[PDB]
C-alpha cells in the first residue's frame, strides 16, 4: 500500500508537527504516504493500533502512549531525545539565573515521569529543594492554567517554573497573566518541545528543543531499514523571552 | 468495507479542525467507524491528498481541505456549486458579524487580514460589502496565501506601518490573528486599549486565558456533526435520512481583544 500510519495522542499538543514533517521529508521521496491516527478521536475505544492496521500499512510510527515516543514497526525499536538531560538543562538554566524557589508542572506520560525525576535529582544535586504539583494527567493547556494558579497560590515564593512541556506552559503563561505577574520580570517560565506555538512572537517561549526534527529523521531511517545511527538524541536550550535572572 | 473514514485537512498548525473532528468522531465512532487524517503538507510528496486517502480504501471521505467513495466537504465549499454534498457555516454572515461588531464599537479605520482560501475569499467579500453598506471604505492587505501565523505577523507589521491610522483588525481566521497579536506586542500596542483584533474559528488557542481572543464561532462542532450525518446518509442510502443542516450559523464570542473606540 506504500502507506505509513503515524500514531499521536492529541492534535491539541503540537509537539509532533515538525516530527511528522521530518518523517515525511524522509519517507515521501521514497514513495510512501502518511496518515495519522490519534488516541482521542480516531476510534471509540483505546485501540489505535487496530485502527492503524485497518488501512493495511507497510509500516507504523508509534508516537503515543507512555514509553519512549516514536517506535517504528514492520506490521505485526525506539528513537527519542534524552529526557533526563533535557529536564536537567531546563532546571540548570533556572538555577544559573539565580532562582532558588523553582517549581515543576508535571505530566503523567513516560517522558513526563522522566522529566520529573530529572527535575528533582537536579534540584537536590544543586542544593535546592524541588517543588512540583501532583498532576498526573495528560498534557493539556487547561490543566496547565488551573494547576499554575493553584501552585502559585499555595507557594507564592515560587519565582520560576519548569513546565514539563510547551502546551502546559501556555497554561502557566495564562495563569501569570491572570495573576498580573509579568513574565519574565516577576516570574520565569521555561517549557519543553519548541512547538510552533513557542516560536511565535506573541508567546515567544523559552523552551527545551526536544530534537523532534532529529527524532523524526532517525525514526524514519530506522523504519526504512526494517522495510549506524543514535537512537537517543540530544536536547538543547532555546532562549526566548520568558526567563530572566532573579 | 473497511469501516475507515479518511479526513483531509490542510495544516496541523491551524487548529480550526480539532473540534470538528471531535464532533465527526462522536457521531461516527459509536457506529463502528474509525478515522485517519491526511493533511496537505506532509501526507504525500505532491499535492494529491485524495490519492493518499484512497490508499487506505476508506468507506467514506470527509474533505476539510481547500481544493470515488462517498464524500462530504466540511468547513468549506465552492461558492458557486450546490451545497448538496457540503456542510459549512455561513462565511458571509460570520464576516458581517465581525465587521459590524467593530463598527458598532466605534471603529472606522478597520482593516482585514485576508487568506486566499474559498472561505477566505467569502470573508473578504463580506468584509468589503459590510464596510461599504455602512459608508466606510474597506482596507485589506493583498496576501492571498495560506493561513499561517508567521504571515499574520509580518502582514500585520507591514499593514500597520503603511496605515497607522488603523484601530481595529478583522483577521480572516484565528491562526492569522495570533500573528496579528504578536505584531501588536512587537509594536508596543496594547490590545485592546490601542488596537482591537477579532478572529474567526474559535480555535482552542482563542479559548486560552493567555490569548483570550474575541472571535467568530464558525460552528465547527455543528459542521462536524451534520457532515457526519450527511456522510452516513450516503453510506447507508436505505436507512432513514435525518434532518441535516448544510449551512450553520456563525456567532460572535466576545473575549478580551476588542474594545470601544
Ligand atoms: Mg520539538
Ligand atoms: Mg471552530
UniProtKB/TrEMBL annotation, chain A:
Keywords: DNA-binding, Metal-binding, Transcription, Transcription regulation. One of its GO terms (molecular function) is transcription cis-regulatory region binding. Mg(2+) binds at residues 18, 193, 210, 212. Coiled coil: none annotated. It comes from the Bacteria. This is Transcriptional regulators. It comes from Corynebacterium glutamicum (strain ATCC 13032 / DSM 20300 / JCM 1318 / BCRC 11384 / CCUG 27702 / LMG 3730 / NBRC 12168 / NCIMB 10025 / NRRL B-2784 / 534). The chain holds residues 63 to 330 of 331 of the full protein.
Amino acid at each position: 500500500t506504500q502507506l505509513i500510519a503515524v500514531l499521536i495522542d492529541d492534535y491539541s499538543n503540537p509537539w509532533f508537527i515538525d516530527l511528522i514533517q521530518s518523517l515525511s521529508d524522509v519517507l515521501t521521496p521514497k514513495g510512501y504516504r502518511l496518515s495519522v491516527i490519534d488516541s482521542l478521536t480516531s476510534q471509540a475505544g483505546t485501540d489505535p493500533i487496530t485502527s492503524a492496521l485497518s488501512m493495511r500499512p507497510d509500516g507504523i510510527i508509534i508516537a503515543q502512549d507512555i514509553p519512549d515516543f516514536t517506535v517504528p514497526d514492520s506490521l505485526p525499536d525506539s528513537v527519542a531525545n534524552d529526557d533526563f538531560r533535557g529536564a536537567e538543562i531546563a532546571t540548570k538554566h533556572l538555577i544559573d539565573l539565580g532562582h532558588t524557589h523553582i517549581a515543576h508542572l508535571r505530566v503523567g506520560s513516560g517522558a513526563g515521569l522522566r522529566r520529573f525525576e530529572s527535575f528533582e535529582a537536579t534540584m537536590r544535586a544543586h542544593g535546592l529543594e524541588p517543588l512540583s504539583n501532583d498532576y498526573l494527567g495528560p498534557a493539556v493547556e487547561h490543566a496547565g492554567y488551573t494547576e499554575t494558579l493553584a501552585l502559585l497560590k499555595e507557594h507564592p515564593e515560587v519565582t520560576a517554573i519548569f513546565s514539563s512541556n510547551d502546551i502546559t506552559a501556555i497554561g502557566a503563561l495564562g495563569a501569570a497573566r491572570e495573576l498580573g505577574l509579568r513574565v519574565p520580570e516577576d516570574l520565569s517560565i521555561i517549557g519543553y518541545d519548541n512547538t510552533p506555538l513557542a516560536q511565535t512572537r506573541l508567546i515567544n517561549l523559552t523552551t527545551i528543543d526536544d530534537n523532534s526534527i532529529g527524532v523524526g529523521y532517525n525514526a524514519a531511517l530506522l523504519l526504512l531499514s526494517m522495510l549506524e545511527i543514535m537512537h537517543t538524541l540530544q536536547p538543547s536550550l532555546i532562549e526566548r523571552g520568558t526567563c530572566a535572572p532573579r
